[PDB]
Ligand binder design. Structure first.
Ligand SMILES: O=C(O)[C@@H](CO)O[C@H]1O[C@H](CO)[C@@H](O)[C@H](O)[C@@H]1O
Ligand SMILES: O=C(O)[C@@H](CO)O[C@H]1O[C@H](CO)[C@@H](O)[C@H](O)[C@@H]1O
Ligand SMILES: [Mg+2]
Ligand SMILES: [Mg+2]
Lengths: 254, 250
């Protein structure tokens, strides 16, 4: 079993911290069950949480592996090995200018904003906002609700893909959480261990994750997507519940 | 006679330079008639055009005078004395943060954006965008058409004032082109020279300017405000027309 988990609104509390999930994560570690973050966050943000690879960043844009992963893949990038699945940020940003020209409306993303502005918009500290701005694949958009319909159509017209991560829309090309999870499972050193995948998440950007796993669990607000399990409470309390009710039983058996 | 002139759309053209206005300006110079730019642009932008003081920037937020102006006013700053008429930018920005609270939504302006972003949104070069970001009084807001009304109501609720510049909304407190014109006229060394003021503007946001002068000329497109002269063609062509038809004869 491998557990693939989203971060914001799933494993992380409302302040972006891992505290509330520690107990459940320790249960999993004790049982030798690997946990793989699969997130809209950047590599810099994941590193700041103290999370080690393998992990998947920017909505599946990048798969990061340990430098000594037994299966040789990707290219060395700063102490890791990286498998790039999506277009680079620079290309997304260039194509966004074309979308903006079509929409006839400004389309602002983090790349247009100061760290100070991103901090104000997100509730992050200035330092954390700098990490959120260090994007390699995916752009986070800052859209007024009134312009969303027009903007999304403009993104499609210019060949970009969009998703939504809980509070913000994102634009990218080739970044899909399920594509990335599939790739990582195919690169797993122990085929048996990778045979059964669990996926937990809370937002639209997790729908492809749920399709790529064998057991899907929704810990967001409201009703779950069809065929995905719910928990009584959202976020880390939902993650904890899922570990204790859905996973632990499956880990003994017979 | 003093000629107060808006920049963009009036003295400047599509790309932002002097069309058939160079000659019109040299004529006024030859007659020893002062020309005072009155603009939404920053001091750094006006300097880049090579314009010498006196000039009025940021929609009347600041009046810049030569350091050696014969009438003592304002605060010394290098080659200038500056008369600040409006709240400083930092204070406007702080009030904006409050306005966001009431509006329950982000209110973004140039201060929140990179020079690269400002350049893309305005059509300016990165270098020109950096100068447009060097604001001392007034903030340029970046608003989608559908959010404008909610935002304006919030700005006013927190004690800010707003104006429309031609493409962007602006927020400030105490920046008014007419107030700045009246102040400069009162600070003019030779009262006889400032007795008759002319005001040329390309837009309706030049109404405060039009009210503060004795002869108002609209060199924009379509009908001019009531009590304001017009030209057949806008721009420096309008400026030239206006100078030839309305001024030179005096
Ligand atoms: O889209 C969102 O709602 C969130 C959560 O998915 O991600 C963005 O917002 C987060 C901050 O709220 C950043 O940490 C991420 O990098 C990204 O920019
Ligand atoms: O609001 C506008 O439409 C123009 C003209 O009024 O001023 C803003 O926009 C100009 C760029 O178009 C800048 O040069 C000014 O500094 C200011 O930010
Ligand atoms: Mg999430
Ligand atoms: Mg103008």
């Amino acid at each position: 079993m491998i557990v693939f988990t989203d971060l914001d609104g799933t494993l992380l509390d409302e302040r972006g911290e891992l505290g509330p999930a520690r107990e459940a994560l320790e249960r999993l570690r004790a049982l030798g069950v690997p946990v793989v973050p699969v997130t809209a966050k950047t590599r810099k943000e994941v590193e700041a949480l103290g999370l080690e690879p393998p992990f998947i960043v920017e909505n599946g844009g990048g798969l990061y592996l340990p430098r000594d992963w037994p299966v040789r893949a990707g290219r060395p990038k700063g102490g890791y090995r990286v498998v790039s699945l999506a277009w680079p940020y620079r290309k997304v940003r260039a194509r966004l200018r074309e979308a903006e020209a079509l929409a006839g409306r400004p389309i602002l993303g983090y790349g247009d904003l100061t760290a100070e502005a991103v901090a104000r918009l997100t509730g992050l500290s200035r330092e954390a906002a700098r990490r959120a701005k260090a994007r390699e694949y995916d752009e986070t958009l800052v859209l007024c609700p009134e312009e969303v319909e027009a903007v999304l159509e403009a993104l499609e017209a210019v060949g970009l893909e969009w998703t939504h991560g809980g509070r913000f829309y994102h634009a990218a090309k080739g970044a899909d959480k399920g594509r990335a999870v599939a790739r990582l499972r195919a690169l797993w050193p122990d085929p048996e261990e990778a045979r059964f995948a669990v996926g937990l998440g809370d937002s639209l950007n997790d729908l492809p994750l749920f399709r790529a796993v064998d057991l899907a669990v929704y810990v967001g607000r409201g009703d779950p997507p069809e065929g995905v399990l719910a928990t009584p409470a959202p976020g880390p309390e939902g993650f904890r519940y899922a570990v204790e009710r859905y996973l632990l039983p499956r880990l003994s058996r017979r």
